[PDB]
Design a protein around this nucleic acid. Structure first.
Length: 46
DNA sequence: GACTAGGGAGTAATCCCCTTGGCGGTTAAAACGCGGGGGACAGCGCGTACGTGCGTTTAAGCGGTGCTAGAGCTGTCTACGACCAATTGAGCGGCCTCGGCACCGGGATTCTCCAGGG
Protein backbone atom coordinates (compact mmCIF):
# COMPACT_ATOMS: atom_id res chain seq x y z
CA UNK A 1 0.00 0.00 0.00
CA UNK A 2 2.52 2.59 1.14
CA UNK A 3 5.26 1.38 -1.19
CA UNK A 4 4.91 1.96 -4.91
CA UNK A 5 3.12 4.73 -6.75
CA UNK A 6 -0.30 5.11 -8.32
CA UNK A 7 -3.10 7.55 -8.91
CA UNK A 8 -5.34 7.57 -5.85
CA UNK A 9 -4.81 11.04 -4.38
CA UNK A 10 -7.48 13.09 -6.17
CA UNK A 11 -5.71 16.42 -6.65
CA UNK A 12 -4.72 19.74 -5.14
CA UNK A 13 -6.59 22.12 -7.45
CA UNK A 14 -5.15 24.58 -9.94
CA UNK A 15 -6.58 26.81 -12.63
CA UNK A 16 -7.29 23.79 -14.86
CA UNK A 17 -11.05 35.60 -26.53
CA UNK A 18 -12.59 38.86 -25.28
CA UNK A 19 -11.81 41.14 -28.23
CA UNK A 20 -15.26 41.08 -29.89
CA UNK A 21 -16.07 42.53 -33.33
CA UNK A 22 -18.73 44.89 -34.62
CA UNK A 23 -21.90 43.41 -36.08
CA UNK A 24 -24.53 44.76 -38.51
CA UNK A 25 -24.71 43.62 -42.14
CA UNK A 26 -25.45 44.81 -45.66
CA UNK A 27 -29.02 43.40 -45.89
CA UNK A 28 -29.95 45.13 -42.61
CA UNK A 29 -28.66 48.47 -43.91
CA UNK A 30 -30.51 47.84 -47.18
CA UNK A 31 -33.77 47.24 -45.31
CA UNK A 32 -33.20 50.40 -43.26
CA UNK A 33 -32.56 52.32 -46.49
CA UNK A 34 -35.77 50.98 -48.02
CA UNK A 35 -37.55 52.20 -44.89
CA UNK A 36 -36.10 55.67 -45.56
CA UNK A 37 -37.46 55.85 -49.11
CA UNK A 38 -34.56 55.49 -51.55
CA UNK A 39 -35.04 54.00 -55.02
CA UNK A 40 -31.43 53.16 -55.92
CA UNK A 41 -28.22 53.36 -53.89
CA UNK A 42 -24.52 53.11 -54.68
CA UNK A 43 -21.91 50.75 -53.24
CA UNK A 44 -20.16 53.09 -50.78
CA UNK A 45 -23.00 53.84 -48.33
CA UNK A 46 -22.56 50.92 -45.92
C1' DG B 1 -37.46 13.48 45.56
C1' DA B 2 -36.32 9.40 41.35
C1' DC B 3 -37.32 8.20 37.43
C1' DT B 4 -41.16 8.18 32.98
C1' DA B 5 -43.63 9.46 28.81
C1' DG B 6 -44.21 12.21 24.61
C1' DG B 7 -43.15 15.72 20.75
C1' DG B 8 -40.88 19.52 18.06
C1' DA B 9 -36.10 20.72 17.14
C1' DG B 10 -31.27 18.89 16.02
C1' DT B 11 -29.05 15.77 12.97
C1' DA B 12 -29.42 13.34 8.94
C1' DA B 13 -30.92 10.57 4.75
C1' DT B 14 -34.28 10.82 0.25
C1' DC B 15 -35.94 12.75 -3.24
C1' DC B 16 -35.68 15.14 -6.99
C1' DC B 17 -36.10 18.98 -9.55
C1' DC B 18 -32.81 22.32 -11.69
C1' DT B 19 -29.50 23.34 -14.42
C1' DT B 20 -23.63 23.88 -16.21
C1' DG B 21 -21.26 22.25 -20.38
C1' DG B 22 -20.85 19.95 -25.20
C1' DC B 23 -22.85 18.12 -29.78
C1' DG B 24 -26.10 17.03 -33.78
C1' DG B 25 -30.21 18.37 -36.89
C1' DT B 26 -32.57 21.67 -39.58
C1' DT B 27 -34.67 25.93 -41.18
C1' DA B 28 -33.85 31.03 -42.38
C1' DA B 29 -31.19 34.77 -43.18
C1' DA B 30 -27.08 36.29 -44.92
C1' DA B 31 -23.29 35.94 -48.66
C1' DC B 32 -21.79 35.73 -53.36
C1' DG B 33 -22.00 36.03 -58.44
C1' DC B 34 -23.82 37.11 -63.53
C1' DG B 35 -26.70 39.62 -67.77
C1' DG B 36 -28.01 43.33 -68.74
C1' DG B 37 -29.73 47.49 -68.61
C1' DG B 38 -30.99 52.24 -66.91
C1' DG B 39 -28.78 56.08 -64.29
C1' DA B 40 -24.53 59.29 -64.29
C1' DC B 41 -22.28 62.23 -66.56
C1' DA B 42 -19.24 64.49 -70.39
C1' DG B 43 -19.46 68.01 -74.72
C1' DC B 44 -21.74 71.56 -76.13
C1' DG B 45 -24.86 75.72 -77.47
C1' DC B 46 -27.27 79.45 -76.12
C1' DG B 47 -29.95 83.21 -74.50
C1' DT B 48 -31.30 85.99 -71.44
C1' DA B 49 -30.74 87.39 -66.98
C1' DC B 50 -28.23 89.14 -64.34
C1' DG B 51 -22.71 91.59 -63.62
C1' DT B 52 -21.26 96.03 -64.24
C1' DG B 53 -20.30 101.51 -65.55
C1' DC B 54 -22.68 106.07 -65.00
C1' DG B 55 -26.62 109.80 -64.57
C1' DT B 56 -30.31 111.64 -61.03
C1' DT B 57 -32.53 111.98 -57.14
C1' DT B 58 -34.98 110.49 -51.66
C1' DA B 59 -33.36 109.36 -47.30
C1' DA B 60 -30.42 107.79 -42.62
C1' DG B 61 -27.17 110.06 -40.23
C1' DC B 62 -26.23 114.20 -38.91
C1' DG B 63 -26.76 118.31 -35.30
C1' DG B 64 -29.64 119.95 -32.07
C1' DT B 65 -34.02 120.83 -29.19
C1' DG B 66 -38.17 120.95 -25.85
C1' DC B 67 -40.29 118.67 -23.08
C1' DT B 68 -43.62 113.98 -21.32
C1' DA B 69 -45.42 109.61 -19.80
C1' DG B 70 -43.70 105.35 -18.36
C1' DA B 71 -39.99 102.91 -15.19
C1' DG B 72 -37.18 102.20 -10.32
C1' DC B 73 -37.27 102.60 -5.49
C1' DT B 74 -39.37 104.26 -0.76
C1' DG B 75 -42.92 102.64 3.10
C1' DT B 76 -46.80 99.54 4.54
C1' DC B 77 -50.14 96.02 5.56
C1' DT B 78 -52.53 91.95 5.14
C1' DA B 79 -54.14 87.91 2.60
C1' DC B 80 -52.06 83.93 2.38
C1' DG B 81 -48.67 79.68 2.46
C1' DA B 82 -45.54 76.43 4.81
C1' DC B 83 -45.21 74.58 9.54
C1' DC B 84 -48.09 69.17 13.09
C1' DA B 85 -51.53 64.25 12.09
C1' DA B 86 -56.85 61.69 11.93
C1' DT B 87 -58.61 60.44 8.35
C1' DT B 88 -60.56 57.48 4.98
C1' DG B 89 -61.26 56.86 0.67
C1' DA B 90 -58.81 57.10 -4.27
C1' DG B 91 -56.07 53.69 -5.89
C1' DC B 92 -52.83 50.52 -6.37
C1' DG B 93 -50.84 45.10 -5.59
C1' DG B 94 -52.35 40.36 -7.15
C1' DC B 95 -55.55 37.12 -9.84
C1' DC B 96 -59.32 35.28 -13.84
C1' DT B 97 -61.44 35.45 -17.44
C1' DC B 98 -63.34 35.38 -22.58
C1' DG B 99 -62.67 38.85 -26.46
C1' DG B 100 -59.89 41.39 -29.94
C1' DC B 101 -55.73 40.58 -31.85
C1' DA B 102 -52.57 37.24 -34.72
C1' DC B 103 -52.43 35.60 -38.78
C1' DC B 104 -53.47 32.70 -42.96
C1' DG B 105 -56.76 31.05 -46.71
C1' DG B 106 -60.44 31.71 -51.35
C1' DG B 107 -61.59 35.10 -53.99
C1' DA B 108 -62.42 39.37 -56.20
C1' DT B 109 -59.68 43.12 -57.59
C1' DT B 110 -56.10 45.30 -59.22
C1' DC B 111 -51.04 46.56 -61.01
C1' DT B 112 -47.70 45.52 -64.44
C1' DC B 113 -44.97 43.33 -69.30
C1' DC B 114 -44.77 41.96 -73.97
C1' DA B 115 -44.79 41.19 -78.78
C1' DG B 116 -46.58 41.90 -82.02
C1' DG B 117 -49.74 44.35 -85.40
C1' DG B 118 -52.53 48.80 -85.97
Amino acid sequence: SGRGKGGKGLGKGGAKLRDNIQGITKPAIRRLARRGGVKRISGLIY
